[PDB]
């Protein structure tokens, strides 16, 4: 009989549609059917009923039906003892929260955050992870700042990789939508970049990026030179995704320095050859990100754009279409701090012989914006035609 | 552990198991058989699929449902895009899933539906050939559907199925049918896959070890083994026992599983694949001899590699030469080039042909001559120059609802000397060519499938001897084509069942250091078993515990007392120590000791010894050591 | 347990590499190789140290070949059929494909101025190939795993495990990519010892573009003046990258000088094994294959004395024993032509003397040559520099380091840097002498899941501060050879023995006139103030409890002003049942 009810529940939740009055009655029937369930029955029936109620509240649009369903969740989960149902209820509250994010009164947000916090101690490493997820979305500003930052920061030293990663992710989520993360958190993020699991190193690198960007002038030696060096050292990571992410992040910390930024292309304390190492990467998605980040770093700084010319000219003769296009567009965008030159024009103009019509258009656009050498451009452009060249001829004449 | 069943199609599994706080998906596959309910999708085509008669189901009609269903002189078909079927999305949320394990490329084609726009954040694990050939298959489905597309404008039949006639009135779900994923969805989905190899032993988040173990079925096909130091779960999907070009079955490492999940059998089990290959070659030679052509609808990288070789051998031994073959598929050059890269994944006969620098597959030779040609499509440039007849064409989709193959059915259809042969059991052939029924072409249907008919599967299971055997319900169901193992228990899952498998963890592997191991003091308590008491400080740090040596002031000194003392031990050994004035109240079930040095009483029960009255501290210690010297301790 | 390593080659030297690794009752031979600089008895490793005068099949459990270079695989048929070995030999599939070719060519050039073709064939019949990251289970309690190393096609670093001891052997590896052949990759497996090569331990090489620009500029400047360039390489290996980049440069600048490769199924092996190359070849091999050149031509002998300008890739590297040495003899007494040394010259060879600055080359039968040609050493050998060694150390995180394939002073410099940066012990044994490394014991236990769950429930009551400690405790039971950490109740139930408890209460008399409930509350306050580290619960029966202790009152104190208090504790907590009573005796 229990199996038949489980089968009916699976069929109903498969065929149900929460989008398409009677919500009070069906919610109360789900509550009553949850109540009768004995201890040491099938927990999957209770999980099915909770996720039914959760979807039904995810599509509510009444501003009081939402609060009634949230009250049902609070009442049922405050007396729940099985950890599987508790973790699923946390995930259900999480799905309700991100689906609305605007419709819950602040008292209900505080109550849900407190209810999620109460499961952090007795959790089973799945309940704890889902509880930190719910804390991440439901904690507001000025109460995440005073209590939840420290409470989650304790769980960076958790015994489980999922719990550590979720603690760092929840700290990041609190930092995003307003919260004063203290600078003393920085030491806790750096030590989290030595974790054996990529899912923790990823969030730790995010947190180092965030902490170095908003406290740029803190000491211990300037806290964004340290963050720049730390993200530079993450270009040698054992995982491809963290390496791609570090290459993308390296260009976003604009307010770093001169003496530290100029180390990246000045090869031989962790930044001393980082962009050269990233440009000579075997993986395409790392080379592209390194080119884009170097373009961003050189867009504002003139001297770096001068010294970052030979490397990005090198990236022209790369036997991948996307890296070539990225280098060409980056040279198009940078082309205000640079003076072209005959030796550079040699390698640069050797790439005017491509079969696909993406490279020639973009490289025409590059030569139009860029500044004896005038002959060789005309010498090479005349061969390729024998629309794009004429427009490139119009702009080069005007300058 | 649970087992969530998410797939009602026996050929295309999708299961979820929960082993240790982790949800693992096994083989997210695509049900392609629902495309046969729709009409064919030709490239550029005449008024044959236009001006088809409407279907009115003899009862109350609607102004809207008319035009959605049209008949093809015996049968009813939906005028819409194919709309594939997929695993159920609400038994679990696809973001709870932490790891997806893929066995074949064929059991792979529903991955962009799961990984891309859901909340999924985990890893995907497969071998290198499964990822590459699954990339070919996904790119080719997207290509075929996007070459000459239609519009999804046929919803109203779905709400009403009892009206409609026999074949599509049993549509399984039909409201969760999805049309197709896109190319950038393919790119994003396959970017989450990480290459593994045979017998790699990769650690999954500290919870267990995953290992693919080479089911000898496809290029890179594998069976999966999840292991801890005390459990072993084995998943068996592809599994061919016959000898053919992939690396043969490794049943050594499936040997002592606690749970054995079995999924994929022949789907044509009364059939010998070798004699069906022979009938294929006989039929194609006979239609070549009669100045006809042959069309073999096929997958781009499956048994076509064997079809080429066996076809050339039998045709040239039949006195036929200069017979052209064309491979027409938008991934055919990629497939033919990539197939000769995989010498390490092949059987011995083909693998040995690369130590001497030769091509392991013969069809590369056929490309250095002009016996085998390949084109992206029938409209591709250069095809019209090299096309000759009679010929054998290996072309697009076996379903005949999209791809190059549809075109051929229009062109070769009305000549009786031409012939189709269907070699895929996943597509009933009389269902497949149902909208082509004024044909007059031969359409022979010789089914090749080398994957474990029931008589081999019974032998495999009773050779493996698992503790538990978890199978679909249709397997244990009657020519005695059913799995019976009377000496073991069989658990049985239908389409939408959560089944609660019986595997209970009782032990866990931890470590101790040398000093605390030295501190151990064994004491013989029974025949071949000794006891000791352990205390230390724990450092888990992932799941790998380690017991270092040391409210820790008294806790690391505790022993335990066994061997309840007898009557003639305490007073006999307490009389002569210096206190020989023992008063013994020997009550009918207990003993009581009164003593004169201070007010104290020692009460003896057959399972408990205790004191009541105390005094100055030295009074306790004589009782202490006098009791302890002749009572057993750890 | 100890890990003992004796190098029969590549100890404070380069070439003739061979190591003997013993741990856990096993013996493993790493990289049976040969010496180019010598051709006497010390050309091959001295297998007498294992067992003199006989087949070694009972004293070696497996042989492991990293890559196909002859300083690492050259003595393989000699070991397999001269002295004798009828066991398993493990290597990667490209190494099994390519080592016979190099061995046959070296046998051709060696017999003229030794093993045979048949014994090459028979040695290759003992080889069991292995794939990437496959845990090849050699005879029980011995595990082998291959990792990508770079530096030639099919090269590997090997991970060897015997009974909780693991060793990583790099062979030859490059931590930076090149045109083909991506970088070396290892995971954080934390081996007890990492054996690493140190050919370039004191250098940090410039970059891809500086080296490529220097090579291309020198070649172009020399050849545009009518001069000729000689490049001594091996038939397969590092020559393919130089061919790729020279063909790329001469497609770009559209030059028309001739370039020859003096050898012809070599590139079909690179075609068969595309899964061992880098990403940009696996991406483009279907349409634009990089292993046929249409600028490299086959070479003929009569072209040596031509008057034009050419670049010649010659068949033996290092200019030691073949056609490269002949062309070097022919072109040496001329200016405005050069030889480019692209690799490492093992000392005792001609190229080592040339790079050492010698201007006089003395050959056999009194032939003296003045090298008026330009001599340009460049580094295209694809070895790991100092930065690559430090990055491998950081990536895999070993407990010890060992250096083999290099020169002694560079090893000493890198050892000083290793100690300064990682605080690790780095060894460097010489040829013939053994190094021994110690490792803890770490015996494992099969604990009970319920015990661990109870301990984790107790600990998970406060946030996870790493400064506090956990206090697991249980019964350690072992029956056959299996140790088990169980609870008291479970172990006693299983064995069948029951448990005796000795239960100690005592009466303490103190002076009060009020109710005994006030006395109990006063006792609770005093115990909480003086201990402040134990859980004290006042059960509503007027009974105090501390975790095993209950405190009661007898007879309801018939006589006023007198209080009789029962202090009741077990043996198991005897200290906290005794000392605190003394506190009573220090206050009453
Ligand atoms: O009591 P626990 O130590 O928490 O054991 C749980 C519990 O198993 P039981 O309560 O039946 O002993 C879960 O079952 P539920 O009652 O919560 O549904 C079960 O989950 P499954 O239903 O997926 O089996 C889970 O096992 P798993 O490892 O798959 O999460 C298992 O935990 P352990 O077996 O690891 O102790
Ligand atoms: Zn080498
Ligand atoms: Zn070497």
Author numbering:
A (entry chain D): 103 to 122, 126 to 325, 334 to 381, 430 to 532, 537 to 551, 558 to 570
B (entry chain I): 1 to 478, 483 to 554, 571 to 654
C (entry chain K): 2 to 114, 120 to 269, 273 to 597
From the article:
Here we report a cryo-EM structure of the Drosophila ICM at 2.74 Å resolution, which unexpectedly reveals the stable association of an inositol hexakisphosphate (IP6) molecule. The structure shows that the C-terminal segments of IntS9 and IntS11 contain two separate domains, CTD1 and CTD2, similar to their paralogs CPSF100 and CPSF7317. The metallo-β-lactamase and β-CASP domains of IntS9 and IntS11 form a pseudo-dimer in this structure, remarkably similar to the pseudo-dimer for the equivalent domains of CPSF100 and CPSF73 in the active U7 machinery. The N-terminal domain (NTD) of IntS4 contacts the metallo-β-lactamase domain of IntS9 and the back face of IntS11 metallo-β-lactamase and β-CASP domains, which may promote the formation of this pseudo-dimer. The structure of Drosophila ICM unexpectedly revealed the presence of an inositol hexakisphosphate (IP6) molecule, with good quality EM density. IP6 has ionic interactions with all three subunits, including Lys189 of IntS4, the N-terminal ammonium ion, Arg2, Arg504, Lys508 and Arg509 of IntS9, and Lys462 of IntS11. These residues create a large, highly positively charged pocket, accommodating IP6 or other highly negatively charged molecules. The 2-phosphate interacts with Arg504 and Lys508 of IntS9, suggesting that IP5, which lacks this phosphate, would have weaker interactions with ICM. The binding site for IP6 in ICM is located far (55 Å) from the active site of IntS11 and is on the opposite face from the opening for the canyon in IntS11 for binding RNA.
Integrator is a multi-subunit protein complex associated with RNA polymerase II (Pol II), with critical roles in noncoding RNA 3′-end processing and transcription attenuation of a broad collection of mRNAs. IntS11 is the endonuclease for RNA cleavage, as a part of the IntS4-IntS9-IntS11 Integrator cleavage module (ICM). IntS9 and IntS11 are paralogs of CPSF100 and CPSF73 in the canonical and U7 replication-dependent histone pre-mRNA 3′-end processing machineries, and CPSF73 catalyzes the cleavage reaction in both machineries.
